[PDB]
Amino acid sequence: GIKLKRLSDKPVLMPKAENEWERAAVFNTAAIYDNGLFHLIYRATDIGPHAKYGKYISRLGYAVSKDGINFMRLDKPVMSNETEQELRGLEDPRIVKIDGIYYMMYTGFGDRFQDDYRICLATSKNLIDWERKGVVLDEPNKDASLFPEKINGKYVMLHRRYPDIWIAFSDDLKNWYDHKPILKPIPNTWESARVGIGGPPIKTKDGWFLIYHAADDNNVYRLGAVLLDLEDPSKVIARQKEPILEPELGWEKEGYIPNVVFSCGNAVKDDTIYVYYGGADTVIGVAILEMKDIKFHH
């Protein structure tokens, strides 16, 4: 079945000692192909991203590439910790573009009380200047994105009421309705502990192609794939049994958080999907999948 193919045995982006805001880790990046270029909005921390290392703050950087492998990067974050909901920063952005506007959903980590993390929304026309729209769902939640277009006149979002992937609908992005779970962990497998989306889903002629992540009972993170019905994305057409990507290389297995591959971004150019992923919550790699190779076992 479906296996992602690494474009490089080295990371495509790494932390930068000279800049405090991204000195420790760059990971879990949004990705989009636009106007002839691959664009990354990447999560970056000043400290290793676990409480055992310290009070890490996540900020969002910008990088750009012609080929999807070799990146140039801006020296300052395009979004920084500004609100109370963002006391400990902004995490794990997912971006789609609808009618000339980029919609980014990210985790605002406050850590003022138990489960003080919230899905937040920001919009942009240019990926540099972001306007905050506030909390999307006022509840402990993350792993969220819009679908890249309206379905039957409505905005559609994926979210993650622990430990399951959920879907919901909205007329205006302000109020959400028709919440329902669509994907759950499976006991005694690689995907037993929890599930959550990767990057935003991608429209194909056979359905919505959605990459997801899961953790096993040792907290090893891997990626998998599902296909959702076009008109009712709450309906799962197919779910591949085996992972599409697992920690294999040294920088996937070792880092601040061991044995993690984790995606928040899948850019598309000429029928090739470029899946960007965090390795060990420390660096960013890329792996590809050609659209024609999206096949689920009949």
Ligand X SMILES: OC[C@H]1O[C@@H](O[C@@H]2[C@H](O[C@@H]3[C@H](O[C@H]4[C@@H](O)[C@H](O)[C@@H](CO)O[C@H]4O)O[C@H](CO)[C@@H](O)[C@@H]3O)O[C@H](CO)[C@@H](O)[C@@H]2O)[C@@H](O)[C@@H](O)[C@@H]1O
Ligand Y SMILES: OC[C@H]1O[C@@H](O[C@@H]2[C@H](O[C@H]3[C@@H](O)[C@H](O)[C@@H](CO)O[C@H]3O)O[C@H](CO)[C@@H](O)[C@@H]2O)[C@@H](O)[C@@H](O)[C@@H]1O
Which amino acid is it at 199? G
Q: Is the dihedral of CA 256, 259, 264, 269 positive or negative?
A: positive
| Tokens read off for 21 | 């805001």
Contacting range for ligand Y; rule: CB under 6 A; set: 45-53, 120-128, 227-235, 244-252: 45-53
Q: Which of 5, 8, 9, 50: binder of ligand Y (CB under 6 A)?
A: 50
Contacting range for ligand X; rule: CB under 6 A; set: 43-51, 181-189, 241-249, 283-291: 43-51
| Tokens read off for 126 | 């240019």
Range 139-168, binding ligand Y (CB under 6 A): 142, 162
Q: Which of 55, 112, 125, 241: binder of a copy of itself (CB under 8 A)?
A: 125
What is the C-alpha to C-alpha distance for residues 66 and 75, in angstroms, rounded to an integer? 19
Q: Which of 81, 107, 145, 263: binder of ligand Y (CB under 6 A)?
A: 107
Nearest CA to 259 out of 213, 219, 214 is that of 219
| Tokens read off for 98 | 């609808």
Range 70-109, binding a copy of itself (CB under 8 A): 72-76, 78
Is 86 an interacting residue with respect to ligand X (CB under 6 A)? no
Q: CB of residue 35 vs a copy of itself: minimum separation in angstroms? A: 5
Contacts of 128 (CB under 8 A, 6+ apart): 62, 78
Contacts of 211 (CB under 8 A, 6+ apart): 197, 198, 199, 223, 224, 225, 244, 263, 266, 275
Q: CB of residue 35 vs ligand X: minimum separation in angstroms? A: 29
Site residues (CB under 6 A) for ligand Y?
49-51, 91, 107, 109, 117, 142, 162, 194
Site residues (CB under 6 A) for ligand X?
28, 49-51, 91-92, 107, 109, 117, 142, 162, 194, 215, 221, 257, 260, 262, 278, 281
